[PDB]
């Protein structure tokens, strides 16, 4: 899920490292 | 933290000095030091752990995830070893699963967090990073499973109350979700003073009208959670200038704005084509954000990337904004459609960042009963005209006309983004 409109999800950004 | 088994303790003289390199900043010497330990003393459990610290060291002085790949492994390693002791057990797992999260390597990170578990059955500050791991992974249900697990045991845990309450919250179970998110952030506890707790501790107070909700933001914004009471994103650039409302030339955005404006019937008539004759590519709003009613978008671009199946819908509104790149390469916004039927009220809520601003063209206004509040101010949309507000401020809508409201949202940075903060933001 992501964070379009709100701020609904644990986290909203992708982890990737460095 | 006793780290060393008993042959440790007979070559703590030349770990320390491997160890004393490391903590010197001699990373490259620390990592060949702890390497030839290894190879002498390839059962050494701080060995291996000294050679797994220096490699997360080098990964983070190099910048590189493959290094990093290289101490998750060596910090296995060390679990594999014989004769390791229980706290360097622990915190070779630990670590190793942190920096597997790091990396976004989320199932090998759940892979450690449930060998942990297993390891240290009564460790309730395991279960609870086990719980985290599902969250990461989108697993609210087995996550949700594991908190219920702690709570049994240790029904106080308030990290376990406010991550069960905001999946209480998640899954709609509002009143139910305030006591947990309430009583953890009152506990405490290291790990509930997080600005989501306090996010989404006052909205659940605000869907069931308990005025308690904005002392809560007020004490969020006191500890230094949100920017105000007002403005309560969590993914932010501090310093941008934030008003809840802003005219085109203070964005700079006039060019864009005139030409959504001159070309607005375009944008319309193939919004409305898409309703008669490709009504699917509007999807329901999907984020709980209605407490009633029919609110569907149509989605161009998402997080920076055009979405080339929904441009061939509207390839005309597509093309004319490919012009455009402070919206369409804005990677925290969208570009959509968004379609609002009569009877419906959207809760009062904020987006995610305050690193964009949020266009609205107005496409099909029905004459009554469609506004938007923003902070403490309603407006309302017009046929043809942009209205421009900062989603990260709390904002409300309501459809109560007697037809269909549609307009086109334009997302674009905030202004005061400089080029290079637009190009390494992490996209939303
Ligand atoms: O009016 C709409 O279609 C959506 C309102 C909203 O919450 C937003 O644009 O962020
Ligand atoms: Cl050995
Ligand atoms: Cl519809
Ligand atoms: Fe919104």
Same mark, same amino acid.
């Given at each position: 899920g992501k964070c379009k409109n709100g701020l609904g999800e644990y986290t909203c950004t992708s982890l990737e490292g460095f | 933290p006793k780290l060393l088994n008993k042959f440790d303790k007979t070559i703590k003289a030349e770990l320390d000095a491997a160890e004393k390199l490391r903590k010197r900043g001699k990373i490259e010497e620390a990592v060949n030091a702890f390497k030839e330990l290894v190879r002498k003393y390839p059962q050494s459990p701080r060995a291996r752990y000294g050679k797994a610290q220096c490699e997360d060291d080098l990964a983070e002085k190099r910048r590189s995830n493959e290094v990093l790949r290289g101490a998750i492994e060596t910090y296995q390693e060390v679990a594999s070893?014989?004769?390791?002791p229980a706290d360097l057990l622990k915190l070779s797992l630990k670590r190793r699963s942190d920096r597997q999260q790091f990396l976004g390597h989320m199932r090998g990170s759940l892979l450690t967090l449930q060998r942990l578990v297993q390891l240290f059955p009564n460790d309730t500050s395991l279960k609870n990073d086990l719980g985290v791991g599902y969250l990461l992974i989108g697993d609210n249900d087995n996550a949700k499973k594991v908190y219920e697990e702690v709570l049994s045991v240790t029904p106080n845990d308030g990290f376990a109350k406010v991550h069960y309450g905001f999946i209480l919250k998640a899954q709609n179970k509002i009143a139910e979700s305030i006591p947990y998110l309430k009583e953890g952030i009152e506990s %405490?506890?290291? %790990?509930?003073?997080?600005g989501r707790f306090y996010f989404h501790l006052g909205d659940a107070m605000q869907r069931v009208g308990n005025k308690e909700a904005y002392k809560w933001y007020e004490l969020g914004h006191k500890r230094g959670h949100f920017a105000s009471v007002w403005q309560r994103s969590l993914y932010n650039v501090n310093g941008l200038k934030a008003q809840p409302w802003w005219t085109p030339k203070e964005t700079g955005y006039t060019e864009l704005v005139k030409s959504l404006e001159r070309n607005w019937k375009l944008i319309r008539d193939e919004g409305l084509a898409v309703m008669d004759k490709? @009504? %699917?590519?509007?999807?329901?709003?999907?984020?709980?954000?209605?407490? @009633?009613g029919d609110w569907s978008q149509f989605t161009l671009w998402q997080q920076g990337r055009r979405n080339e199946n929904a441009c061939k819908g509207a390839p005309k509104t597509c093309t004319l904004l490919? @012009?455009?790149?402070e919206t369409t390469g804005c990677r925290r916004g969208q570009i959509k459609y968004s379609i609002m039927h009569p009877g419906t009220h959207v809760w009062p809520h904020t987006g995610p960042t305050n690193c964009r601003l949020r266009m609205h063209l107005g496409l099909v206004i029905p004459k009554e009963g469609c506004k938007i509040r923003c902070a403490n101010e309603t407006k309302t949309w017009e046929e043809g005209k942009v209205l421009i507000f900062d989603d990260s401020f709390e904002h409300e809508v309501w459809q109560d006309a007697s037809s269909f409201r549609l307009i086109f949202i334009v997302d674009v940075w905030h202004p005061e983004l400089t080029p290079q903060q637009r190009r390494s933001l992490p996209a939303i």
């Open positions: - | 070893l014989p004769d390791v %405490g506890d290291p %790990g509930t003073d997080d490709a @009504k %699917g590519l509007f999807l329901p709003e999907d984020e709980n954000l209605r407490e @009633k490919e @012009k455009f790149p």
